[PDB]
Amino acid sequence: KTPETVALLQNLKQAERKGILFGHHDDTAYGIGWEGDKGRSDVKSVCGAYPGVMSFDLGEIELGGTHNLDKVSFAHLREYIIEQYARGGMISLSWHVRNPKTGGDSWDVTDSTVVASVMQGGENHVKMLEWIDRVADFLLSLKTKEGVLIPVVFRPWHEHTGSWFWWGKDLCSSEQYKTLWRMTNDRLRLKGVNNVLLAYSPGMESDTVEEYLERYPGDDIIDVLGTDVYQFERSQYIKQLNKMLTILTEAGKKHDKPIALTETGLEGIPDSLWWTGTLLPVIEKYPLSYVLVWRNAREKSTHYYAPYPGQVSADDFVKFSRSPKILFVGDNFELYKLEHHHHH
Ligand SMILES: [K+]
């Protein structure tokens, strides 16, 4: 891993001391009522600072086209990534990859033999490695104008304990799933992709650490232990989020990995006090390195997870943002600076 990448990991590992970076998907790409405006951010428009983490998706890079599945160009993603690094924030990338057997999208679960087909000897193995190489080439293009590779937390194969993606629980064995991870790591390493940290991120199906780790590909592959948990009903969310963050904290101590709430949110945040009244009291109890809420879909204006100006939860988001526990660009962290000393 590059020096800046090791520094990022070491700074994620001191979350207990520094606080929780706040994140938003596609934050500088678009939001409610806009797309592509230079420097614009629904998060910054509400609270005045950029989120400490921004994530974007590489889905459809494997098809060799110019835009991802959410119609954002890869050349724009690279710009947004360079700009987030320049201001000192973190970047994460997910990968809603197409179905290599059916030609469908990530959510095509018609065929439960897709992962088998990309194993060694399978009809789609070479193509799967070509697809991963296309991700590798994009990652290698994430450079500062001075030529420094930009560290990224790459989070492929997510939500694998559910069965809504073609790599999900009912669609492959535990060993097949771990092999996806090994193929991914192998190709990234061969390509010299030394600017990636890998994050593991199943949802809330697991009730225990044993279950959470059943499909874990190993400490030598994974750098960040995450989970994706959304609010559908408040009491259940509080129970299930506490349950998963307890699992993450226990597992992260057992395996010496930082932890993160890699996706969460309340769609349309109709609860005007969601941020301080529901989310913060849960997450502040756990040593999270970051918490990321999902995109503000310009193309479906009910589908948003961060506020925007005038949105009913916006004032409360401002109050949340002022918590010393929650970190935005401008706050007291330096992700890419090594402080050169062991933990004790
Ligand atoms: K803050």
Author numbering: 30 to 373
Paper passage:
This PUL contains the genes bacova_02092 and bacova_02093, which encode the putative GH26 β-mannanases BoMan26A and BoMan26B, respectively. Clan GH-A enzymes share a (β/α)8-barrel fold, a conserved retaining catalytic mechanism, and essential catalytic residues (nucleophile and acid/base). β-Mannanases generally have an active site cleft with a varied number of sugar-binding subsites (−2, −1, +1, +2, etc.), with the reducing sugar being located in the + subsites and the target mannosidic bond connecting the sugars in subsites −1 and +1. Galactomanno-oligosaccharides are further processed in the periplasm, degalactosylated by BoGal36A and subsequently hydrolyzed into mannobiose units by the β-mannanase BoMan26A.
The catalytic residues Glu-188 (acid/base) and Glu-292 (nucleophile) are located at the ends of β-strands 4 and 7, respectively, and are conserved within GH26 (40) and other clan GH-A families. Comparing the structure of BoMan26A with that of CjMan26C with G1M4 shows that the −2 to +1 subsites are largely conserved, with residues His-125, His-187, Trp-193, Tyr-259, and Trp-323 being conserved throughout GH26 (28). Because of crystal packing, the fused His tag of one monomer is situated in the active site cleft of the adjacent monomer, potentially aiding the formation of the crystals. Based on substrate binding in CjMan26C, loop 2 appears to close off the area beyond the −2 subsite in BoMan26A, despite 18O labeling showing that BoMan26A is capable of accommodating a mannosyl in the −3 subsite. The low B-factor of loop 2 indicates low flexibility in the crystal structure; however, a stabilizing factor may be that Asp-99 in loop 2 hydrogen bonds to His-373, the last residue in the His tag of the neighboring molecule in the crystal.
